[PDB]
């Protein structure tokens, strides 16, 4: 059921002239380069990039915005521990200590509620959460939208 070759497909599909059409993409046929999932040039020619986002966080947190941070626990690129330590640096207070959240009868992952931020892990998901844990990723989105803590029982 899982398919690691998805990017192969997309790249195929987006390069189709009929899809571009239906998309209103590359109207003039001007883009004389193939569509790719990423641009290696941009990727490799990157400029400014502050070390920390923490301050924006502090700001928006004060501004009263809703802030959720999530993490697929089997990702190794930007892993869970990274996030744990980072958020921890905000020094926020806890409103709800780390608890398991459920989807029906399973543990979907874990969650901790701080004063001004909600942190959520998705058990068994890689970097692309909605790809590896589609059902649970959707639950996550709904609670976020309702501004409601991930569910116990």
């Amino acid at each position: 059921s899982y398919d690691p070759c998805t990017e192969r497909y997309s790249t195929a599909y987006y390069n189709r002239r009929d899809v571009q059409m239906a998309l209103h993409a590359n109207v003039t046929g001007a883009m004389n380069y193939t569509w790719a999932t990423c641009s290696d040039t941009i990727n490799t020619h990157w400029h400014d990039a502050p070390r920390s986002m923490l301050p924006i966080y502090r700001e928006l947190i004060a501004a009263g915005l809703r802030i959720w941070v999530f993490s697929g626990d089997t990702d190794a690129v930007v892993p869970l521990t990274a996030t744990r330590y980072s958020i921890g640096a905000l020094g926020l207070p806890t409103t709800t200590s780390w608890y398991p959240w459920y989807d029906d009868q399973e543990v979907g992952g874990w969650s901790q509620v701080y004063k001004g931020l909600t942190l959520v892990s998705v058990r068994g998901a890689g970097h692309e959460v909605p790809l590896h844990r589609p059902r649970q990723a959707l639950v996550l989105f709904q609670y976020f939208l309702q501004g409601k803590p991930m569910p116990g029982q």
Binding site: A49, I56, D75, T81
Partner: protein, 255 residues
């Protein structure tokens, strides 16, 4: 906006919601235009919030990822032959706006070819803001809607940066309610720190390499590691072998 409407995509099953896609010019002078894809929630869910989704890279496309192999309404068949519906699409619950950014990513483009070699957080943030403002003007029925910005990876940067402009902007048409970040860059140092510990706790690097990394990289940025740092990671990479770094326990694509 009506011009942006999509009728049916090639090989795309019939659905109960609408979609739009097209460009928004963010820099007239430069000739920078951004491609977007809006997948709406069905009627029964309306009026649903407006969610701006951003993929990272930097240099990676939200349409490619987000829309196509993640939370988007469909999944591409093998050989890019067609589409299947994503049973768990986020557009089941919100109006989802996928943005190819920055200019040069996906279908977005720049008239000024050097644009492509000068990209950065600031411009990216600024152009996005612009995009937004204009977008809303084209989709005025979206003004005042509850609005959220969400993304993953390098978008740990993009999301709050943009969130910030927006907030500060004092744009009254954009009802920004918050943002959500998935597996994202938050703080270089801490992230570097948790990154190595995680690897070691996952049996993906040696004790020595674990140590080498902590010593080479803790003072760097994730995007612009020092040469010590890369030397270190080059080893780590050798130690990790042929696994998918983005999903430890799943197979790699064999094509």
């Amino acid at each position: 906006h009506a011009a942006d409407r999509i009728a049916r995509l090639p090989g795309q099953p019939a659905v109960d919601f609408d979609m739009y896609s097209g460009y928004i010019t963010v820099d007239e002078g430069a000739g920078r235009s951004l491609f977007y894809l809006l997948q709406e929630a069905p009627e029964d869910a309306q009026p649903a919030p407006l969610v701006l989704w951003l993929n990272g890279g930097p240099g990676c496309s939200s349409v490619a990822y987000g829309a196509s192999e993640e939370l988007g309404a469909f999944r591409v068949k093998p050989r890019g032959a067609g589409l299947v519906l994503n049973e768990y699409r986020w557009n089941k619950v919100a109006n989802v706006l996928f943005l190819d950014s920055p200019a040069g990513v996906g279908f977005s483009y720049t008239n000024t070819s050097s644009d492509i070699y000068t990209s950065g957080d600031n411009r990216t943030a600024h152009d996005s803001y612009a995009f937004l403002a204009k977008w809303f003007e084209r989709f005025p029925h979206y003004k005042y809607r509850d609005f959220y910005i969400a993304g993953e990876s390098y978008a740990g940067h993009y999301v709050p940066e943009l969130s910030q402009l927006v907030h500060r902007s004092k744009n009254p048409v954009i009802n920004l309610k918050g943002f959500m970040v998935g597996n994202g860059l938050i703080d270089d140092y801490h992230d570097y720190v948790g990154t190595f510990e995680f690897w070691w706790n996952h049996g993906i690097v040696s004790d020595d390499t674990y140590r080498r990394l902590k010593e080479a990289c803790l003072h760097d940025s994730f995007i612009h590691p020092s040469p010590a740092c890369d030397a270190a990671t080059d080893v780590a990479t050798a130690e990790q072998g042929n696994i998918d770094m983005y999903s430890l326990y799943t197979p790699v694509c064999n094509i």
